Amino acid sequence: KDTYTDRLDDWNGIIAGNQYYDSKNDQMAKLNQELEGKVADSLSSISSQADRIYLWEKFSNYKTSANLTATYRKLEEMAKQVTNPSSRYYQDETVVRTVRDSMEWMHKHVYNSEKSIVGNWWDYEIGTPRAINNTLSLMKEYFSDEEIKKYTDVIEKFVPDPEHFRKTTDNPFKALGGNLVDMGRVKVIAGLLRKDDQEISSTIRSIEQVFKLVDQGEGFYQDGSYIDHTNVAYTGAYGNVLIDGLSQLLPVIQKTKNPIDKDKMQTMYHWIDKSFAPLLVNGELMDMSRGRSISRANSEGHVAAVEVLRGIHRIADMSEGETKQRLQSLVKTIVQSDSYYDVFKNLKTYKDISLMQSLLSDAGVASVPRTSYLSAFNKMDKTAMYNAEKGFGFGLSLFSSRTLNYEHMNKENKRGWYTSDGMFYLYNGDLSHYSDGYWPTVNPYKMPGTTETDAKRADSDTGKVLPSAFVGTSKLDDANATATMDFTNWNQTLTAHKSWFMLKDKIAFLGSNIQNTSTDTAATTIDQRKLESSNPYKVYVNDKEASLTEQEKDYPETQSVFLESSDSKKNIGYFFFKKSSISMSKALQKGAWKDINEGQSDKEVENEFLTISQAHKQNGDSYGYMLIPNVDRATFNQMIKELESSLIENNETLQSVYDAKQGVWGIVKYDDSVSTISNQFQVLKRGVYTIRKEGDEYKIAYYNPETQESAPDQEVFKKQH
């Protein structure tokens, strides 16, 4: 036909890739079989109506916008198979007719220009229009140009401006990040289908906004943070949509008369290296970066990670030289380190499957275990740490006056109340920990690391920002950093100076100034670990075996707790600097995904959890312990003796832990008094510090979380360096 019907061909190769199909290819045949089964179900359950109310009973209530998108996606599945030579539906007369009669019908009484958004705007402007674009693209040899223009003006009615969404509503918003990328998959393809040049250029120019790093608002930040929905850490969900969708569009865009400058797209590599990579541990995308998507059963950590990985892979493929090879190695080593999830379970096109196969089988592409790293995403109040020597990852989830604690919208993530109240994540040998129904079965009132009262919480509640701006991380190097959070709970009845000292192979948890003005009981959850019936833990308290029961058991004067597995890479030890009174229990916890997400299954799920907590019955209370993972019992026992005097201070103004082996100090000052540390030096300013002694020299890493700035050494450190 023309150049539009050239770009659409390339698009078809990206979103379906029928030209790359090979029935002798194991993985490809699997996806093909999945699509065959989907189309069969659709064709057989579709109402062979003399014009009935709906096309599919499962998606009957057209008041629920979700049913529109779900309906059109079914037709896209048909378009993919009708154009797949190896499909039983290849060029099938009934299938070709169904897709047509279905477009006309939906276009008649459901989705048209004379209609208005009912329910979720996303389905009317993004979900449905994408499905329509793809269907018409794949089956453009069966549809009339006029027919194409006809079924597409509705998209022009609801989405006429490439810079704003919800245009037809009484409250539109400027498209940025993920949503803006989807604006391209909506208007760039629709523009190619309607052969609309003004639509193409205008949309491409608008998309370029995505390559700009911001220092406020939504988008990618220089420090790697990614913000969306005004002030929510969202690299792992909306960031995913951004890289996933943009990597699909680029090959087509660069072939149009409106290609994007190579220097503008250079930022993509910054996102990959600074924003995405740090959040991927053993093939899992850290949940603290995925917002409300953690409440979706079909999108657990390892599945979500593939959205990012396939995007990075596509980008590597369009890159060249060392950039291509290095990105290939990144994808390769991450996928190969994931012994739990089969990456192919989330590669939904033949080209993506093909790309991954050649990459994994190419001896020329290096696959070396990733090195240690520590990312302080201060712009979104999250911290990611990874130790390659011992093999564990650590995620610190916070929020401040600058960010929302948790997102609960569209009936999703109803119980994520405390997922950012100083919650921590440990990624060890159990790659399945936060998967297999962790989210619908975890006790939402006892999120690990959080200090809270036992007051009941409402599902209808929504997120909030923190009163204080004193929340941040001071990173010294790839293995050492210090963080703090001037904590106040949701209803201002409890406070706590919570601090963390990341010291290479362990993390110290310090809490002071714990006060409670309510009638509710206060306690800190040391941990709530999901267990594996296959890898049982042998629990030790003060180095003596203890048998945990479903009923809580109190352990006063506890100096240590050790969770012993057959696999040392799953061991977890907790050393209490000062003998503390804790309680522990191991119980089966049941729940359904619907409990935390209305649109999910109400099917019962259950998991066993080991809960450790410390009650705070008095004002001025505190806690202090060292988390030591991936070491055996004897080694753990040896380490706590080494850490005997590691606690320097833990009060209302000063908190500090010292690693004598490393010669590193972690320090948090809540005021500007002169603090003398280990009779060696003095720290003089409110803020966060991570210091290292190398001979008579001192390496200083200072961070003022409120002003988001460091400071000259002489202003904060004494006894220049």
Query: 39: closest CA among 83, 8, 2?
Result: 83
**Residue 661: what are its φ and ψ, rounded to 5°?**
-60, -45
In angstroms, the CA 323 to CA 312 distance is 11
**Interior/surface letters 387-412, b for 16+ CB within 10 angstroms, e for the rest:** beebbbbbbbbbbbebbbbbbbeebb
With H, G, I as helix, E, B as strand and everything else as coil, classify residue 119.
Answer: coil
Could you give the C-alpha distances from 638 to 109, 460, 490, 644, in angstroms and in order?
A: 73, 48, 40, 10
| 40 CA to centre of own chain | 34
**How do 219-220 and 392-397 pair as beta strands?**
unpaired
In angstroms, the CA 243 to CA 569 distance is 32
Determine whether 1 is exposed, middle or buried from the number of CB atoms within 10 Å of its CB (0-12, 13-18, 19+).
exposed
Radius of gyration of the chain (CA): 27
Q: Give the list of residues 6+ apart from residue 651 with CB closer than 8 angstroms, or none.
A: 512, 513, 622
Which residue bears the tokens 């799953």? 570
Please write down the long-range contacts of 141-146, taking CB distance under 8 Å and 24 or more positions apart: 142/82, 142/96, 142/99, 142/100, 143/100, 145/195
In angstroms, the CA 142 to CA 139 distance is 6
What are the residue ranges of helices labelled H in 581-699? 593-596, 633-642
Are 506 and 493 within 8 A, CB to CB?
no
In angstroms, the CA 19 to CA 13 distance is 7
Q: What is the secondary structure of 223-271 as a DSSP string?
A: TS-EEETTTEE-TTTHHHHHHHHHHHHHHHHTTSSSPPPTTTTTHHHHI
Tokens of 140: 């453009």
- Partnered with residue 512 across adjacent β-strands are 497
Could you give the C-alpha distances from 610 to 426, 530, 564, 704, in angstroms and in order?
A: 14, 7, 13, 37
Are 447 and 360 within 8 A, CB to CB?
no
How many other C-beta atoms can be found within 10 angstroms of the C-beta atom of residue 61?
Answer: 12
- Partnered with residue 605 across adjacent β-strands are 591
Q: Nearest 5 degrees, angle CA 27-CA 29-CA 31? A: 75
Any idea what DSSP says for residue 369?
P
Query: 548: closest CA among 581, 573, 583, 584?
Result: 584
* Residues in the chain, total: 721
Q: What is the secondary structure of 545-587 as a DSSP string?
A: E----SS-EEEEEEEEEEEE-SSGGG-EEEEEEEEEEEEEEEE
- Annotated active-site residue in 107, 229, 302, 497: 229
- Single-letter code of the amino acid located at 534: S
What are the residue ranges of helices labelled H in 91-144? 93-109, 121-122, 128-138
Helix (H) or strand (E) segment spanning residue 78: helix 66-82
- Annotated active-site residue in 84, 133, 179, 413: 179
Tokens of 715: 């202003």
How many other C-beta atoms can be found within 10 angstroms of the C-beta atom of residue 637?
Answer: 16
Q: Is 229 a catalytic residue?
A: yes
Are 585 and 561 within 8 A, CB to CB?
no
- Annotated active-site residue in 238, 540, 670, 689: 238
Q: Is 637 a catalytic residue?
A: no
Tokens of 593: 């995904």
Determine whether 209 is exposed, middle or buried from the number of CB atoms within 10 Å of its CB (0-12, 13-18, 19+).
middle
- Which residues are catalytically annotated? 179, 229, 238
